[model samples]
Target: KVFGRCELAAAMKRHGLDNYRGYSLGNWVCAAKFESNFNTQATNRNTDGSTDYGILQINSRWWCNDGRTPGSRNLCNIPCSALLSSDITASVNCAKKIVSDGNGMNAWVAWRNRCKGTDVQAWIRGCRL
Candidate 1:
């Protein structure tokens, strides 16, 4: 499922992503915009044999286990498939774990390149939430 900007913001907010780890909802929304374009089923295969999954693009290398990435930790203790679901609870949960690991939103390279130190309000403008 593909989400509109505001819709994605709302979904992230509902999952407690607003202001998570000092990163605003816009920060997350912006990363998703560049990473996966708000597509729930988005996936990216890495040269290392790992895959990035879902709206937030959680990686199989350190986050979820896809049974394909060699030495995957499955640190989130969830299947990569869950991240691809439109429900998004698992995606948001794993994202919080990623941010809470002290890497900050910089964990997502997309955020570092696109949203870091930038005004993110445009990502959530006009949202009723």
Candidate 2:
């Protein structure tokens, strides 16, 4: 797939993460794979009928305050187009801070362990930040 390098870098910058060493991209992609299989345009609905959207699955009511409008019926207040316009890596960084601090990988590792019975952190034991 044609990942947006600029957007990824910008997301890293926004989240205060290193953009090199396959840093932000690797982390973002890992999270994407875990959360939505790298589908930047994916969306899902909760039991309460609220929706989550995009690769990071940002909730429309929670994060897209500026984009939500009266006429828009879809819960995807922030379209993938707008989400794609911003730096994904940076956005993930922002998410990490809000959701998991710098150890978002912990959540990834935990999920992998639970579902796949695979320990991903073992491969990067000596290379973590």
Candidate 3:
């Protein structure tokens, strides 16, 4: 079940992330597009011994725990399954915590590589505000 841009934009705004941590909703939405493509069930294990979780691709090393990912800090204290669920509340919470930690959107390589300094208004195009 992948999330389209309109729903995700609405959800992010509802979560109070319209302008979070100096990054706009466009940044978050664009990140999700490239990171997990808005699929809540998304999970990826990288060569760097880390796993990214959920729509925002929260990191296993510092956020949620999947048990299979060795040495996960689980700082968010959320089960990986919660991040993978249909509802994005838990995932949104954890994502906020991540951006607030200081790196901002720099915490996400996908954002840096894809959305940074790039125009992505199309992610929110046609979404009823």
Best by TM-score: 1
Report each candidate's C-alpha RMSD, comma-separated, in the order given.
0.7, 7.5, 1.3
Which lDDT tens digits does candidate 1 get at residues 23-56? 8888999999999999999999988999999999
lDDT value, residue 96 of candidate 1 = 89
- Which is the better candidate, 2 or 3, if ranked by lDDT? 3
What lDDT does the true structure give each of the candidates?
0.92, 0.45, 0.85
lDDT tens digits by residue: candidate 2, 77-122: 3443455333465335335443453444443442344433354333
Error of 1 at 23 (Å): 0.8
Model 2, position 55: C-alpha lDDT score: 63
* lDDT for model 1: 0.92
TM-score of each: 0.97, 0.45, 0.92
Tens digit of lDDT per residue, candidate 3, span 76-96? 999878898878899888988
What candidate 1 gets wrong by more than 4 Å, as runs, is none
